[PDB]
Ligand binder design. Structure first.
Ligand code: NA
Length: 167
């Protein structure tokens, strides 16, 4: 079932989510399925459970075709933990389905490792770089009640997607 995506300004996006504790369950499988369906209908590349008002450490992401590549594998990741693999930052465009019509340039770590669990309870640990790593950092911030405007450094880059002409 496609779920409503709540928009920036909803206080539910500002919560620190608790962990998923029903790995392998039918309930978590149904939630994940709704999340992939919801992310697909909105044409997202990532979606975090709090954006559908579900207070849990859970995200989905990935795609073949969306600008970007090597396309990230479709992944559902519970209880994600991230760490940078270098201090190197890279700027790149981010927009949010909870922030429709907008985007800004945001610095993110270029290289990370993320760990958590697939919805069947098997562990996931991967190194990622570039767009893949950016997506995961963006969704991870949702799970700690943080949205991308609070990461903007150059406000000349922030505006509506159909009007920005920043290089
Ligand atoms: Na908060």
């Amino acid at each position: 079932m496609i779920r409503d995506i709540i928009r920036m300004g909803d206080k539910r996006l500002l919560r620190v989510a608790p962990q998923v504790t029903n790995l392998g369950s039918a309930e978590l499988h149904a939630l994940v399925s709704d999340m992939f369906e919801t992310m697909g209908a909105a044409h997202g590349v990532g979606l975090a459970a709090p954006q559908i008002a579900v207070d849990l450490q859970l995200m989905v992401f990935g795609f073949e075709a969306s600008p970007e590549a090597p396309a990230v594998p479709l992944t559902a990741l519970a209880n994600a933990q991230i760490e940078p693999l270098s201090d190197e930052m890279e700027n790149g465009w981010e927009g949010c389905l909870s922030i429709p019509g907008l985007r800004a340039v945001i610095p993110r770590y270029r290289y990370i490792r993320y760990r958590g669990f697939a919805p069947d309870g098997s562990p996931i640990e991967r190194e990622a770089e570039g767009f893949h790593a950016r997506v995961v950092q963006h969704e991870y911030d949702h799970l700690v009640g943080r949205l991308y405007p609070s990461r903007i450094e150059n406000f000349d880059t922030f505006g509506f997607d159909d009007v920005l002409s920043y290089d």
